[PDB]
Symmetry: C2
Subunit: 431 residues, 2 copies
């Protein structure tokens, strides 16, 4: 009993947009283990419940006092005296404490902080770093440092501009270490600022939620030549690929069954799913686009399947809102061959055990796994250890700008250093 959970305490803290979120400390004899919960803006309809207070007098209703109370008064007292090494057991206990399919009673934001902190307490109990401990939980045979996929032109709900599609990313796929990958990413980002400033002017180089540039662009094609120019100017021709996140659900009108390419503007530009496939095929041909995430609405399984088959072997199709890190949605995606990459978001599902199960299910069926931040992030670095632990080779955790993004990139540097020069880097299919 001396080695068990001694204290569990939740508190409301701010995320990188200044919105409240939940952080949890688990205390054991080995110390205080702290994990914070991120928060999406373009949240899928099938995501586990993010519980907010709705008190118009605090943060216009975005308080997390109820989720914090649920940690302090409900979940915490159940965990005291328990063996933190029993990850599946404690995650299952919290699932049953909640008793609902969507974590709508306690909140996925109450449960996840606990799940995360338990795993860190356990890693400390074993006397191994978090990535090592999580690797054992996941049965991972080979750790690797991931290629970082840097969202450097921000759009959608994340900026700032007319641009309807959410994320335009660069990934140093030909780097041979994480150190080099991160430096190359930063150098291109710096070149990109100069290019954007020259083309669009001073007022164009302020940043979006994920640290990417938020230039005054409307056209979804327009960022792509700019990315290639920055890659070239920084001295890294040939070393980079492009990744997209369309977040296409956010533009979609269910009644009209079409996508609004100008939803942040006074007048609409209605576009069909077929008009989109033509665009995606053109993108994949004109540029080294190796990954397109959420190219269609979150329930367009047929659209997803069509593009997955069309770009088979050239461009992975990533489910994010389609799959919501959830084995049930993933099984539907597998059955329909809807996509071949999982965007893994721990807070889409709400426990470490379930997120791990989702990764394993995806990899067993031949998919890649891209571990992911949310657009509302914290100083928390859990996903850096998690992506190494899963050996997936792919992470997106922001542009190389803003501390809630660079904290993850830096933690990856520290892990790289621990593992030494024989540690694998990158995603083999892209190298």
């Amino acid at each position: 009993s001396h080695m068990t959970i001694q204290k569990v305490h939740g508190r409301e803290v701010l995320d990188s947009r200044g919105n409240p979120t939940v952080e949890v400390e688990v205390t054991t004899e080995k110390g205080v283990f702290r994990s914070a919960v991120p928060s999406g803006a373009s949240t899928g309809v099938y995501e586990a419940c993010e519980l907010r207070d709705g008190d118009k007098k605090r943060y216009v209703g975005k308080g997390c006092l109820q989720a914090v109370k649920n940690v302090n008064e409900v979940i915490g007292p159940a965990l005291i005296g328990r063996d933190e090494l029993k990850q599946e057991e404690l995650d299952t206990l919290m699932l049953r404490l909640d008793g609902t399919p969507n974590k709508g009673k306690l909140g996925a934001n109450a449960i996840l902080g606990c799940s995360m902190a338990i795993s860190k307490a356990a890693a400390a109990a074993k006397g191994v770093p978090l990535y090592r401990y999580l690797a054992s939980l996941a049965g991972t045979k080979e750790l690797r440092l991931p290629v970082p996929c840097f969202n450097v032109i921000n759009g959608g709900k994340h900026a700032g501009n007319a641009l309807p599609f959410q994320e335009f990313m660069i990934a140093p796929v030909k780097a041979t270490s994480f150190s080099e990958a991160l430096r190359m990413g930063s150098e291109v980002y710096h070149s990109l600022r100069g290019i954007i400033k020259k083309k669009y002017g001073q007022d164009a180089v302020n940043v979006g939620d994920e640290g990417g540039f938020a230039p005054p662009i409307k056209d979804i094609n327009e960022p792509l030549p700019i990315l290639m120019e920055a890659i070239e100017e920084a001295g890294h021709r040939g070393k980079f690929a492009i990744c997209m996140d369309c977040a296409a659900s956010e533009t979609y009108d269910e009644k009209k069954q079409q996508y609004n390419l100008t939803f942040k503007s006074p007048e609409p530009t209605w576009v069909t799913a077929e008009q989109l496939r033509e665009t995606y095929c053109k993108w994949a041909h004109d540029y080294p686009i190796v990954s397109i995430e959420d190219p269609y609405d979150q329930d367009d399984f047929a659209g997803f399947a069509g593009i997955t088959e069309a770009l088979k072997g050239k461009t992975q199709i990533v489910g994010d809102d389609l799959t919501v890190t959830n084995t049930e949605r993933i099984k539907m995606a597998i059955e329909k061959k809807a996509c071949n990459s999982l965007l893994l978001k721990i807070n889409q599902i709400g426990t470490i055990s379930e997120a791990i199960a989702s990764s394993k299910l995806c990899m067993e069926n031949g998919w890649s796994v891209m571990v992911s931040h949310r657009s509302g992030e914290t100083e928390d670095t859990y996903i850096a250890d998690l992506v190494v632990a899963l050996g997936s080779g792919q992470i997106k955790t922001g542009a190389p700008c803003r501390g809630e993004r660079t904290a993850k990139l830096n933690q990856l540097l520290r892990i790289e250093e621990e593992l030494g020069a024989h540690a694998k880097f990158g995603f083999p299919g892209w190298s």
Copy 2:
């Protein structure tokens, strides 16, 4: 010897702009103690040396490999086996290891990471939190949570726009706890986004380096009514004051002896120091401006003195580039009655012992002390403990936005919680 410094290791990590900086780990039997060094953009000419590599092939010359080497090969080996509790002794050793007045041999960025990490190792050795340990080093009689001064409209070298002056801040001076202060700050920030979007459009609400809005404003007066509107709209009329950082050295032309209010634009707007004093007096009258930082060039001691005397008792005048956290410059400022507040930047001077000495010298001569971030920040939270430890009641560490800013605000929440409901909040002169 079992309790002494066991390992010292430096590494290059990224700051919140994606530029390299230095982080240092000190290892003792009590664990691994990690501190990272921030970096200014509008750096005073009298600041201690930030040592960069100048290798055009890495980060266009901004690498910190040499400072990191100096930690690993020079400073680290000197500290092994030493008693980390001896802060003044170890800081003085590092000063002498460098042997230059500006830390230009080893780098202030090599030395400071060591100074910081030593103090954290020592706090752990004493078994007290960092703020408690630092309070003892400084002889502080009363801890307090500071009023946060939130830079919510970003200008100068930190954005993004025509705006020549650097920082327009809001400070919840009438809050009665840090919790409330931070929530109020965030609520106003949120209201401000809506106001800026309505007045200037979508493209105006992207953020600068410190998480403030970077609207397309040229006129230095123009942000002030917008700040009052946001305060009112958020429901906090009467609770807030304004703080300014003109960073006026950045606009100053030495030969012309005038300030360029449009230095980021094709054509110049030349303005005299007398034209500035009229503006400052008008500001202080029209708005609750309680603090103006660097209203003049970093060597205009006479200008500083004139405005300090004119706003005596109404608006504190803060030396930043004037004083550079440096007892020699501070003595000149005291002699000339040039200012009455110190902006305290640990990396302007480069050791904890010297930064503490600067705080003590300032307070003994009746000045306030505003502990400060740099515009290039990290996930490091040292200044949160430091401002509590000094009991100064004033911090500026960003808008409530971007993780390198919110990490500090959150650490302040944690400290507040530890200290309990009888803990003092705020700056008495403003409450």
